[PDB]
Scaffold this active site. Sequence first.
Site, short mmCIF file in Angstrom:
data_model
loop_
_atom_site.label_atom_id
_atom_site.label_comp_id
_atom_site.label_asym_id
_atom_site.label_seq_id
_atom_site.Cartn_x
_atom_site.Cartn_y
_atom_site.Cartn_z
N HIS A 195 0.78 -1.22 0.00
CA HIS A 195 0.00 0.00 0.00
C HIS A 195 0.81 1.26 0.00
O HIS A 195 0.38 2.33 -0.47
CB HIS A 195 -0.92 -0.02 1.19
CG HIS A 195 -2.05 -1.05 1.08
ND1 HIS A 195 -3.12 -1.12 1.97
CD2 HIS A 195 -2.17 -2.03 0.11
CE1 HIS A 195 -3.86 -2.16 1.55
NE2 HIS A 195 -3.33 -2.69 0.50
N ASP A 196 2.01 1.16 0.52
CA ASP A 196 2.90 2.28 0.43
C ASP A 196 3.52 2.43 -0.98
O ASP A 196 3.51 3.55 -1.54
CB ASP A 196 4.04 2.15 1.45
CG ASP A 196 5.01 3.30 1.41
OD1 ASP A 196 4.57 4.41 1.10
OD2 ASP A 196 6.20 3.12 1.63
N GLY B 246 5.68 6.55 -4.59
CA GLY B 246 6.06 5.15 -4.52
C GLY B 246 6.41 4.73 -3.11
O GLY B 246 5.71 5.11 -2.15
N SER C 259 5.15 7.35 2.75
CA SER C 259 4.16 8.38 2.87
C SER C 259 2.99 7.85 3.66
O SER C 259 2.31 8.66 4.28
CB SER C 259 3.71 8.81 1.49
OG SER C 259 3.08 7.74 0.78
N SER D 85 0.11 -16.12 0.91
CA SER D 85 0.41 -17.42 1.52
C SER D 85 0.68 -17.19 3.00
O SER D 85 0.76 -18.19 3.71
CB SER D 85 1.66 -18.04 0.94
OG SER D 85 1.78 -19.38 1.39
N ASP E 178 -4.85 -19.39 3.16
CA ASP E 178 -4.44 -20.70 2.70
C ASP E 178 -4.32 -21.52 3.99
O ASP E 178 -4.40 -20.92 5.06
CB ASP E 178 -3.10 -20.66 1.90
CG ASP E 178 -1.69 -20.55 2.48
OD1 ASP E 178 -1.48 -20.40 3.69
OD2 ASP E 178 -0.74 -20.61 1.70
N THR F 82 -1.71 -22.75 5.62
CA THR F 82 -0.52 -22.61 6.39
C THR F 82 -0.21 -21.12 6.47
O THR F 82 0.78 -20.72 5.83
CB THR F 82 0.62 -23.35 5.70
OG1 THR F 82 0.58 -22.85 4.37
CG2 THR F 82 0.50 -24.87 5.67
N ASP G 156 4.69 -20.74 1.45
CA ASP G 156 4.66 -21.83 0.53
C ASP G 156 3.61 -21.64 -0.60
O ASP G 156 2.84 -20.70 -0.71
CB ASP G 156 4.38 -23.08 1.36
CG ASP G 156 3.05 -23.12 2.08
OD1 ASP G 156 2.21 -22.22 1.94
OD2 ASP G 156 2.81 -24.07 2.82
CA CA Z 1 1.10 -20.57 3.36
CA CA Z 2 3.90 5.81 -0.63
#
Ligand code: CA
Ligand code: CA
Length: 336
Positions: free
Chosen positions: A48-49, A67, A71, A177, A194, A196, A201
């Site tokens: 998200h950043d 990017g 922020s 995962s 998932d 695990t 994995d």
């Molecule tokens: Ca997993």
């Molecule tokens: Ca950012």
Amino acid sequence: SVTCPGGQSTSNSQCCVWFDVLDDLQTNFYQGSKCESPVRKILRIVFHDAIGFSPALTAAGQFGGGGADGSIIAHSNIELAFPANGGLTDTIEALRAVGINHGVSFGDLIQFATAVGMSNCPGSPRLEFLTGRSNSSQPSPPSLIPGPGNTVTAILDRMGDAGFSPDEVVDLLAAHSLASQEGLNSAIFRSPLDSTPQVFDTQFYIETLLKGTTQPGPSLGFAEELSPFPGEFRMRSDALLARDSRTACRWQSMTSSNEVMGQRYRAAMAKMSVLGFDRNALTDCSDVIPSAVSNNAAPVIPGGLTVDDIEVSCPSEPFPEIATASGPLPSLAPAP
Ligand SMILES: [Ca+2]
Ligand SMILES: [Ca+2]
Ligand code: HEM
Ligand SMILES: *[C@@H]1O[C@H](CO)[C@@H](O[C@@H]2O[C@H](CO)[C@@H](O)[C@H](O)[C@H]2NC(C)=O)[C@H](O)[C@H]1NC(C)=O
């Protein structure tokens, strides 16, 4: 050559402060180097950043986002009001304090806490770590984070604008995962994506491809689909990307080798960490990052389901032979 105050050997003097923030994060943020909710929230935060970056908004004369600039912490007051950033305030404040206390930039700190958290989860690769991202940022523009109710075309266009191909969007999704949801369906808090949630994995790719058979909670939540067994949550974007012809063959090649999955994931993450930056202006401090414990389990179709229960969607490549477990159907405990 460069020996840091603590006796460790590194490539550059710029890496020595990171052995101190490694100790703080392991002891405190990660509660004794655990792979639990703090690692999963930081993996949401790094994405998200970094994805608040849009060349198309720049081309049209608007600020397109910096990017991977931190922020989301420096401007949390505006960014945590975005729809996709709920359930993150507590982790952002814990990180703000480590950042202010060690004198490190917020963008570098998010990238660093992601490599360290992943080293606490068995199966993980060693992520690259670069230092030197500037600490000043402008707030991310709104609407640049893909949402779980978006179409695959919408997700591929937003991701493509930030710079990822359809294959890299699937590679980046290996982070599910190590995942659960808390705000899509409050009634089954921390239901794993998932079986695990503590092992990095291939099970996420195998299990989103199984036929949706089970409603895990009292009702269906936002962007929730039927999942293959009790306790597992399936979000719509994951179900759709596994089945779409533009992403289905790469999703299927990610099911049988944890080694191929981790190489691809490490490479997409190194690209995502420098969105908004020139990697040749940063210093490589990857040797500060420790190794994770290896995952020795082989990929499996869980609980008695077989290849006839997975909805093969790559029309060219046949489904790989994966092991079957002589089981009754699992019921997953909430992720820790
Ligand atoms: Ca997993
Ligand atoms: Ca950012
Ligand atoms: C196609 C893009 C993606 C979409 C639409 C998406 C959507 C979501 C949503 C809605 C949640 C549930 C959050 C909650 O309610 O608690 C979630 C969780 C998560 N996502 Fe994704 N995700 C995507 C890509 C990624 C990427 C690329 C990463 C990071 C490399 C990531 C890492 C995670 C993790 C680790 C969690 C689990 C959070 C937790 O257990 O607390 N996601 N994602
Ligand atoms: C990076 O920039 C942020 C400001 O955007 C700095 O954060 C502030 O730091 C002061 C003093 O260190 C704190 O009292 C403020 O509460 C912080 N504000 C926010 C919004 O977090 C941070 O110190 C800067 N770090 C570096 C290394 O320059």
